[PDB]
């Protein structure tokens, strides 16, 4: 009933767990609304501050809404940056496989 989506952030500067975590939230709030966010249940399970890579969990039926929301992220904390998804997947090991493992992940 859950899905994990891997993402990388393209920016001039670095960002910390707390920062992108907040951003991911406001993104769903603006785009999906309080109700939408409630249904999507977006959770930031892990974010590698070194490689600006991370994983997000969401309801199986709202994956593309969380993606749609993250894509509209123009800047994050005053610093221009865009965040793009690398791919969705059933389990984390399976996701951490086909996408992250080829970054500093295992």
From Swiss-Prot:
<dbReference type="InterPro" id="IPR002759">
    <property type="entry name" value="Pop5/Rpp14/Rnp2-like"/>
</dbReference>
<comment type="similarity">
    <text>Belongs to the eukaryotic/archaeal RNase P protein component 2 family.</text>
</comment>
<keyword id="KW-0963">Cytoplasm</keyword>
<dbReference type="Pfam" id="PF01900">
    <property type="entry name" value="RNase_P_Rpp14"/>
</dbReference>
<dbReference type="GO" id="GO:0005737">
    <property type="term" value="C:cytoplasm"/>
</dbReference>
<keyword id="KW-0378">Hydrolase</keyword>
<dbReference type="GO" id="GO:0001682">
    <property type="term" value="P:tRNA 5'-leader removal"/>
</dbReference>
<comment type="function">
    <text>Part of ribonuclease P, a protein complex that generates mature tRNA molecules by cleaving their 5'-ends. The RNA is catalytic, but its KM for pre-tRNA is 170-fold decreased in the presence of the 4 known protein subunits (Rnp1-4). The protein subunits also decrease the amount of Mg(2+) needed for activity.</text>
</comment>
<dbReference type="InterPro" id="IPR016434">
    <property type="entry name" value="Rnp2_archaea"/>
</dbReference>
<keyword id="KW-0540">Nuclease</keyword>
<comment type="subunit">
    <text>Consists of a catalytic RNA component and at least 4-5 protein subunits. Forms a subcomplex with Rnp3 which stimulates the catalytic RNA.</text>
</comment>
<keyword id="KW-0819">tRNA processing</keyword>
<keyword id="KW-0255">Endonuclease</keyword>
<dbReference type="InterPro" id="IPR038085">
    <property type="entry name" value="Rnp2-like_sf"/>
</dbReference>
<protein>
    <recommendedName>
        <fullName>Ribonuclease P protein component 2</fullName>
        <ecNumber>3.1.26.5</ecNumber>
    </recommendedName>
</protein>
<dbReference type="GO" id="GO:0004526">
    <property type="term" value="F:ribonuclease P activity"/>
</dbReference>
<dbReference type="GO" id="GO:0030677">
    <property type="term" value="C:ribonuclease P complex"/>
</dbReference>
